């Protein structure tokens, strides 16, 4: 019994099969993330990603920021998180504009792990990526607003 195997049994592709790389639970978890929901509208996946990330970013800015001790710690940190979300939206938009064209199909792989055809993920198109990045921006702003509202605006004892 050996645990590590070559990719799909093909030993000449630069990768391996390992419990970390390909275990049942890990594979399921990775496939169930918005980035890998190929058959879903890119806008909704972007919404989910943006919500998660915007809510994430508020904490470090608020607690570790230069105005953490000041009474306006929540406001300052939330504004910083929103600004970072805006900059990330700028980065996404320029990446999509530079890396995609309207008249080209999706650059995503068209084959699955068993060798059967499937519609390439539309996220890697021009308008698909535009929808995904718009959804990400909206979700990020919403997540920052929610995290800011959850604290400070409402007490809610934490820590």
């Amino acid at each position: 019994y050996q645990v590590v195997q070559p990719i799909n049994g093909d030993p000449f592709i630069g990768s391996l099969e390992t419990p970390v790389t390909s275990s049942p639970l890990v594979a399921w978890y990775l496939s169930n993330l918005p980035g890998y929901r190929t058959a879903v509208n890119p806008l909704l996946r972007g919404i989910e990603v943006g919500l998660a990330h915007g809510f994430l970013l508020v904490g470090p800015f608020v607690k570790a920021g230069p105005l953490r001790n000041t009474e306006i710690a929540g406001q300052a940190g939330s504004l910083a998180a929103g600004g970072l979300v805006v900059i990330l939206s700028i980065c996404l938009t320029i990446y999509g504009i530079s890396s995609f064209n309207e008249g080209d199909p999706s650059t995503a792989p068209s084959l699955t792990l068993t060798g059967r055809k499937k519609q390439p993920d539309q996220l890697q198109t021009a308008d698909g990526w535009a929808k995904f990045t718009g959804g990400f921006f909206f979700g990020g702003i919403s997540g920052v607003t929610w995290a800011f509202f959850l604290l400070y605006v409402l007490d809610l004892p934490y820590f």
Binding site: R37, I47, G83, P109, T112, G115, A130, K131, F138, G139
Partner: protein
């Protein structure tokens, strides 16, 4: 491809070169229609490349300008200004 030990065929180059998606779902939307019907309707105006880029750039610029030009004294010590008398140099001043 994959007959026994063969790992090459011109008929299917995509499989031969390992052009798979290790984690693509190929599953239907986990969201119910109602939630998507709201998100796709309220987040619609932000899904244009040029429009979104221009709006983001100018809106962020105006927001930064407004927030920096109207900062309160407890925010930035730079603009609150000095609060002590100035010292003299060794001979200048």
């Amino acid at each position: 491809y994959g007959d026994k030990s063969v790992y090459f065929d011109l008929e299917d180059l995509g499989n031969t070169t390992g052009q798979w998606d290790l984690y693509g779902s190929d599953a239907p939307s986990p969201y119910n229609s109602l939630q998507s019907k709201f998100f796709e309707t309220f987040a619609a105006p932000f899904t244009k490349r040029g429009l979104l880029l221009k709006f983001l750039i100018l809106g962020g610029g105006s927001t930064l300008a407004y927030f920096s030009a109207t900062a309160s004294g407890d925010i930035l010590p730079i603009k609150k200004g000095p609060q002590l008398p100035p010292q003299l140099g060794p001979r200048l001043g």
